[PDB]
Write a protein that binds this DNA or RNA. Structure first.
Lengths: 63, 47
RNA sequence: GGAGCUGUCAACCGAGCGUGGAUCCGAGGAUUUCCGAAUGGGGAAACCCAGCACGAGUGAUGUCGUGCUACCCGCAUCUGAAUAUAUAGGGUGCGGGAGGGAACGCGGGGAAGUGAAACAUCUCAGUACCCGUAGGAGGAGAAAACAAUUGUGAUUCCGCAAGUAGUGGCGAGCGAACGCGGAACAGGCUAAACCGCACGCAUGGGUAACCGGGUAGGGGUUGUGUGUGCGGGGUUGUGGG
RNA sequence: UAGACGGUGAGAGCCCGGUACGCGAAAACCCGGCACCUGCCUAGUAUCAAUUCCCGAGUAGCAGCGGGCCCGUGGAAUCCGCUGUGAAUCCGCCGGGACCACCCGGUAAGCCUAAAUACUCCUCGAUGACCGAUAGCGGAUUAGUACCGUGAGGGAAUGGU
RNA sequence: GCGGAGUGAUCUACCCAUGGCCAGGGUGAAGCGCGGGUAAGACCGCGUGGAGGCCCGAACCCACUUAGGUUGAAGACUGAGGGGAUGAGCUGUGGGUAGGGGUGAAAGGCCAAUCAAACUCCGUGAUAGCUGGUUCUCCCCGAAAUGCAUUUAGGUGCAGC
RNA sequence: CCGUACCCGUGUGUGGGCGCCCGUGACGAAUCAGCGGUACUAACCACCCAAAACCGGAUCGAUCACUCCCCUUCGGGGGUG
RNA sequence: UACUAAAAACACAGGUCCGUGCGAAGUCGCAAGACGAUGUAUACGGACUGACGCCUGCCCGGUGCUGGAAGGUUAAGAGG
RNA sequence: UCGGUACGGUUUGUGUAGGAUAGGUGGGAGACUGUGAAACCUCGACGCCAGUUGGGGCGGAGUCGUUGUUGAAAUACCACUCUGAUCGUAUUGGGCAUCUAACCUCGAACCCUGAAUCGGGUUUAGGGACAGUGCCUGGCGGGUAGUUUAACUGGGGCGGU
RNA sequence: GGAGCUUGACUGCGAGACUUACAAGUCAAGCAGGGACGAAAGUCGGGAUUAGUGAUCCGGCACCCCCGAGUGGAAGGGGUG
């Protein structure tokens, strides 16, 4: 799971890979986006949301 | 994490005494169950 | 505007218009089969087939005509299941979008050949190329910038600086900045502390100690605290609110 | 104030269409001006003690991995992105090329900002020590046609009485 | 030849669903019944019946040898002879897998007459120490094929002429 | 096109035949009292396989603590108990 | 092996081994999701051989695999 | 449970002086009347029938510094003795065991789906803070991609330089 | 060949030549300082000579105030060995 954080825009970063011999190739840094059940009130539908840990730290924190 | 504890919990202690939540226990056990709230500005309400 | 027209290609007929203003020029408007974003459904594009409503017509089914009918987003609003609160959904309504365009711009993705007398780092290059995405230009911008003791006082662009200091299997090669001189030269609104209110959560469900401050009194009642929201205020670095 | 070009039977200022120059817009559009309409203010400016609050938060900064800036992780600052941790509001915080004390400068994590600059599908007017039909756009002529190709695509020749 | 972006499974390779074709003969399994056999079985000989990745042999699909053709009648054929021909079959319609990938009863062959990685366009005026070309004249003067070093000996730099 | 069939559909026609509506016929509720069944089933029970601890027997070892004799280079094993 | 080469090459049956305990293994795809399979150890994918008959000898040293933990070596992180 | 950070506490080896065996040294060369009382009885880590320290009871107005035959032995005041071992007050890593509360379940039933075997929601049941995933990091790895693999070579190769 | 004492198997320079494509290599009288042998004159800048070696970049040790990205320091860089 790496798809863009639904409520921030934390997309993947793209770049290279500095090998020991410096033969760089393409790689990307995916954000730690986890699938959580999200509600809008005490006891809501608990739909679904792939969201980053920084939002688990502040924002849409339900469970 | 500093949550205003509103229920007698063995882990944390007496209601309104203190709090040392390990950044997640309260997130998925106190805040969804209605046992504690976020100490945003309620510290004045508690004391 | 004016006496000749009926376009040309290919040029021979026919029959007509015209000084009362034709042909011709330019604008606006109407009409605008069918396909194509094509979008009532569907599709071998230019084909077929439906539904709703109005109306024409046949002695009546058939047929025709004019309108409406995709999706997604957002806005207002009714209902709001499984499941009770309640939401997702569903329903109705009004706007916008959807695809093209010759080049130009931004962000982001991201090569090889070549060169390196081979060649991997590297270079050719963040070009070509795909998507997104605008605009008539855009981007960038109002100093958490430069200088280094004289200070300047938003950004951008051309030219110096310079093929330098520098960086590089110190190889091929790459390549600035400060500062100076020019073009055009504009800087202005918001958040937050606070205050008065609406919504919201607790307390007091009473002695709240508030009701524009205060005085003399009264009622003693919605006081207090706090989340969201509207409107005042405040928007700055010699620090300011 | 017309000798620019072109055409007319051959080399035209005075033959012709035109040029110089001056006129010229109902209506529509664009621009500008005028009036209406819309919309802001019953001041916080100034002197002062400094008790208290505030100046953009999972941000800054730190660590690791990467990008890029002359700067090829190197002693590697500034800037951007990802991942964990994770501060403060003026005796503050960041920068001034590892870094540290002092000094100058500006107060980030919120928004907008025309001109100068670049470009030409297309439409005007003009130019040319540019071409003259095997050249110029491939295309002066039924031209992106005939034709070739499953198709994407490739892609002619023919001017002159 | 390399890279990107696109295009083609309408021939061919494989598969999928769905219809069809296979004249006419030959052989005559199991099963069944009878008789013999055994208490039954095992076993033998008969009749019906009729199966086989069965046989000979047409259409049909192939392409084994030879001859012919070979600027051919044809960018892979013909004639005379052969193999399979009720099956792992053939063939049409319809569809899909598409390029560092597909497919393959496996040959490194087929993928629109080209496959030890298809085609078109773009990068691209690709590059090559290599081959071929490099357009009118005249006048003066006039070499080397030696030496050093070279991921170098068919090239180049410096020296010598 | 002459002649003869078949299918879908509309409207007109005859009379028949059925039903609307009335009428008729057949099933047929509705509550209350009792009583059942256990039907579900709190509990509890029959079976019911599993069974937290605690006790134990063996199992080998490249685990380890102790020991017998055998070896050495000194680091290490045997059948063992 | 169209377009020089049809066989002694290939291929199935048969016989072994390896792997797989279920959105299995393996493959396609980055993932989702498919195939395998509307199957699940008498099944499935993979490797060698290629009916039947008799058989399939010796060798675990090297390199593979499958199991093992004493020690050694042993990144980051922690600590410093 | 193991192993740790900080810290309040009775506090630790018959190796040597010996009523005096704590790595050691000390606001005091006594902590006053202001200490767990040299009585038998009996035994706790050391255990040496010996002790600073003891181990439980007590003839309830004194062990004694100031009665050293030693490092000045009187530290159950101090460095709170290195204070092990340990009694535990906060903190904390790993492993061990369990749970439900995140999370997971092409595990069952139900809902606009009466338009579905996908999805989505609920409930239930079972795994379960593991796994998968993100960052960093080690290993493996011709399955994949890009390159190299010298020369006079008495043609080239082997050879030798 | 042999014996006694020693460390010039040094420092900063070295005109001028050979040789050579270039880099590179090779010799050098004599001078300043300071020292060894020598009573002295004088010899000594390794071995009777020629073979015993390896360009550049980068990195490491010691040393020299050479700089020190505002200043004073440091990191780092620079010079000599």
């Amino acid at each position: 799971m790496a798809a863009v954080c639904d409520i921030c825009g934390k997309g993947p970063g793209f770049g290279k890979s500095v090998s020991h011999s410096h033969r760089r190739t393409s790689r990307r840094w995916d954000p730690n986006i986890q699938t959580v059940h999200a509600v809008t009130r005490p006891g809501g539908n608990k739909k679904r949301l792939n969201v980053c840990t920084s939002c688990i730290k502040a924002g849409k924190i339900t469970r | 994490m500093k949550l205003i504890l509103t229920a007698d919990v063995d882990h944390l202690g007496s209601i309104g005494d203190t709090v040392e939540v390990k950044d997640g226990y309260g997130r998925n056990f106190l805040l969804p169950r209605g046992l504690a709230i976020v100490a945003s500005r309620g510290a004045q309400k508690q004391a």
